[PDB]
């Protein structure tokens, strides 16, 4: 009923985002990014991960399947 | 040539939103939320309402003609 | 191959923005503004320019082949 994606998280310039949210939909099932940016979750296979952190672009990303997934995440356009 | 928009600012919980900003349109007339989230405003009954407060994505209502309206602001999905 | 754009940059009032990042496109070639809120950027004639300032919403203007240009900065409907 479910499957585990194993994911790793990286800022555009391949580094690891460490401690980002990785969250299935809008639910409560959700876990956070290692030392390595790696983060295991047992989600739907038809569903959808959302990956935030902080000074990034929070991203939605389709599961699709996939038990391993890379995530890039982008910087925020604007500061306060 | 108003109507007074007696309106209700709650979270996504139904918590009241204490401080909201409440204002017509982009004009100058504008309230907060008192307390117990409440507002009163006179506004042309044709008019929309953007409702923020810090935390919350800025929301526009229309008024539709309606002396009581609800508002259920959503978080924001960043920080820095 | 460039031209050079002297631009000036303001708020909704008229007022410069001072220190504002102007920016060719995604690029390294960036500029910031003076005590004036003018800036000078060599650029391609057809490329966009991205403007950027703390409280501000970020802005793409295309160049349209334009030696001098206005920007007019909003301000960021959130915050935090
Ligand atoms: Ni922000």
Redesign the interface.
Known sequence: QQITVKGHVVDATGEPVIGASVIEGKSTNGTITDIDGNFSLNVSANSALTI?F?????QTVSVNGKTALKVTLQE?????
């Open positions: 935030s902080v000074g990034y672009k929070t925020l356009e604007h500061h306060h």
